[PDB]
Design a binder for this molecule. Structure first.
Ligand SMILES: *C(=N)[C@H](C[C@@H]1CCNC1=O)NC(=O)[C@@H]1[C@@H]2[C@H](CN1C(=O)[C@@H](NC(=O)C(F)(F)F)C(C)(C)C)C2(C)C
Ligand SMILES: *C(=N)[C@H](C[C@@H]1CCNC1=O)NC(=O)[C@@H]1[C@@H]2[C@H](CN1C(=O)[C@@H](NC(=O)C(F)(F)F)C(C)(C)C)C2(C)C
Lengths: 297, 298
C-alpha cells in the first residue's frame, strides 16, 4: 500500500503567512491576531559579519517596516523576544486559527510550510534530529517559514526558520524565540554534534517495510534489548527504553522487535546492494505513530 | 538534500466530502452542486465482478449520504461519467475555488491530498509512471482522494484514486472519468506492464546529487545522446529529445548531460554498494523543472 514522507494539511496555516521587509532584507512572518512574529535578523543592516543586535534595535525605525499579504499593515510596536522579532500591527488577522505553542524534541516529526516573500510555496514533513536541527531544503528567502503539527485537532506552531549551518543542516527557533540546539542567529561557523539516530524510528521504519512485503533483512536471529542498547551506545543510536511501543506492529507482522534489533546491527554495516522501500541505508525519519497511522489509519 | 514536496492544499481541503452507499465509505470532490467520486461506491459486492449499469438501475438516491463536517448534502441526481460517479446535490459549495480539469502525462509530478472517509489527512507529492500508475500510500477508505497541481496560479484537478494493483502500484482517473493507464475499476487480476524509466527525471535526480556533493558516480567517460537513446530502447528507459532542459544544471554543476548518461548505464546494473541521496537505485520522480526550483528557487 506504500510508505511516503507525508505532510499534514496546511489550510489553517497559509492565511497566517505574511511578507516582512526592512530596508533591503525581506522574509516571512507569522500573523496571529494583531501581531507578527519573524526572525529578528530582518533589521540587520549587514548580514555579512557578526551582528550587534543591541545596536540594530537602537537604530530601528518603525516606518522602515512593511508587513503585507497580497493588504498592507503598518507596524505600531517592535520588540525582541529571544531571537525572534515581535511586531504589533494595526489589523487583526480575521483568519486566526485556534492554536498553541510547543517545542519539538528529538525524533519527533512535524510539518514545514516553506514560504517565499510571504507566499506559501510548498509543504513537507521533517524530523527533529538529536542535535536540534532538521534536514530541510531551505534556500534564500525562506527565513520565517513556519513549522507546525496537529495533535487531536490542536494546532501547534513549533518552528520558524533562521539559518543553515556550514554542513548544510538547518537551525530554527520555536515561537517563544528560543533557538533549537542552542545555536546563535549569527553568520559564523557553528559546529553540529554527531547525529544520534532514533532507534524507535528505525524500528518503525523496518516494520513499515515488513508490512509492504519487504523481508530479506529479517532472519532466524533475535538480539536482546540489553545487548542492542550496549551496541547502540557505541554506534550513535538511541537506547530503547522498552519494546512496548511496538506490540500491535509486532502482532500484525508476527515479527518481534528483538528480531528487528538484530537486523539494525546487521543493516548498519550496509545493505549490500539491496533496498528497503528504495532506501539504501537506515532511515529514522518516521516515528512509530507516523507509521501505524499511515499503514492502518 | 532532494525532497519530494507538495503544493499547499488550502484550496482543495474544503471541497472534500464523505460519500457512503451501503457498506462502502470513501471520498468525493464537491465542486458547485456536483460531487464527483469513484463509481464503485454504488456497488453491493466489491469482492466479485461488478455489473455497473445493473447497479445504476437499482440506485436509490435516498441511500447516498454525502457529508462535510456537519452539512448533509442530499443527492438529487446520479449519473455515470467514465469510471466516476457524478452526484448533483441540493447545496452549492461556498468554498469552490477557481479551477480547471487537466490530464497528467508520464513523467509529470503532481500533488495528492490523501483523505480518509471524508477527512483530509495528509499531503504528499507523487509522479506519473509510464503505465499510468503512481507510487503513493493509499489504504481502506482513501478512494476518491484528489490529485492536484497549480501552474501560474491556475488550480487543476488531475487525479482521483480508485484502486491498488497487486504490485502496490496505485491507479486513478482524471476528473472526466478516463482511467489512467486504461485499467478497469473491477476487483479482478490486472497486471501492470513493463515500467519505463523517465530518463529526463533521472538526469535531474543525478544533477541534484551533484549539488548535494555526491559525485562518486561521475567518471571521466562520456556517452553520446544518440548512443544513450539506442541503449534506452532496450533497457526500458525513455529517449532523451534534448540536453537543453539541463543547461542551467550542467553549468552550475560542471558536468554535461552526456557524462551523466554514462552514469545512468553504469548505475542501472547496481550502485555497487553505495547510495545516492539515500536511494539504493535510480529514481525518476523528479522533473528538471522540479529540481531547478527546489535547488535554486525563483
Ligand atoms: C534566510 N532567508 C536565510 C536562509 C538560509 C539560506 C540558505 N539556507 C537557509 O536556510 N538565512 C540566512 O541568510 C542566515 C542569516 C545570516 C547568515 N545566514 C545563514 O543561513 C548563513 N549561514 C551562516 O553564516 C553559518 F554558517 F554561520 F551558519 C548562510 C551561509 C547564508 C547559509 C543570519 C543572520 C544567520
Ligand atoms: C478504495 N478506497 C480502495 C483503495 C485501496 C485500498 C488498499 N489500497 C488502495 O489503493 N480501493 C478499492 O476498494 C478497489 C475497488 C475494489 C477493490 N479495490 C482494490 O483496490 C483492490 N485491488 C484489486 O482488486 C486489484 F489488485 F485487482 F487491482 C484491493 C485488493 C482492495 C487493493 C475495486 C472496485 C477495484
Amino acid at each position: 500500500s506504500g510508505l511516503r514522507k507525508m505532510a499534514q494539511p496546511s489550510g489553517l496555516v497559509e492565511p497566517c503567512i505574511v511578507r516582512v521587509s526592512y530596508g533591503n532584507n525581506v522574509l516571512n512572518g507569522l500573523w496571529l491576531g494583531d501581531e507578527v512574529i519573524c526572525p529578528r535578523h530582518v533589521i540587520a543592516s549587514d548580514t555579512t559579519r557578526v551582528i550587534n543586535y543591541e545596536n540594530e534595535m537602537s537604530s530601528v525605525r518603525l516606518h522602515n517596516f512593511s508587513v503585507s499579504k497580497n493588504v498592507f499593515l503598518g507596524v505600531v510596536s517592535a520588540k525582541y523576544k529571544g531571537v525572534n522579532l515581535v511586531l504589533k500591527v494595526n489589523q487583526v488577522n480575521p483568519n486566526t486559527p485556534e492554536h498553541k505553542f510547543k517545542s519539538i524534541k528529538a525524533g519527533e516529526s512535524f510539518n514545514i510550510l516553506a514560504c517565499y516573500e510571504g507566499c506559501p510555496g510548498s509543504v513537507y514533513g521533517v524530523n527533529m534530529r538529536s542535535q536540534g536541527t532538521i534536514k530541510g531544503s531551505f534556500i534564500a528567502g525562506t527565513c520565517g517559514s513556519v513549522g507546525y503539527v496537529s495533535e487531536n485537532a490542536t494546532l501547534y506552531f513549533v518552528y520558524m526558520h533562521h539559518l543553515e549551518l556550514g554542513n548544510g543542516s538547518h537551525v530554527g527557533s520555536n515561537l517563544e524565540g528560543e533557538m533549537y540546539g542552542g545555536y546563535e542567529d549569527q553568520p559564523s561557523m557553528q559546529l553540529e554534534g554527531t547525529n544520534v539516530m532514533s532507534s524507535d524510528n528505525v524500528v518503525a521504519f523496518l516494520y513499515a517495510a515488513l508490512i509492504n512485503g519487504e523481508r530479506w533483512f529479517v532472519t532466524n536471529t533475535s538480539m536482546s534489548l540489553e545487548s542492542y542498547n550496549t551496541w547502540a551506545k557505541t554506534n550513535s543510536f538511541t537506547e530503547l527504553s522498552s519494546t512496548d511501543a511496538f506490540s500491535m506492529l509486532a502482532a500484525k507482522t508476527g515479527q518481534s522487535v528483538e528480531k528487528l534489533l538484530d537486523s539494525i546491527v546487521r543493516l548498519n554495516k550496509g545493505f549490500g546492494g539491496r533496498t528497503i522501500l528504495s532506501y539504501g541505508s537506515l532511515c529514522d525519519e518516521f516515528t512509530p505513530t507516523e507509521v501505524i497511522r499511515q499503514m492502518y489509519g
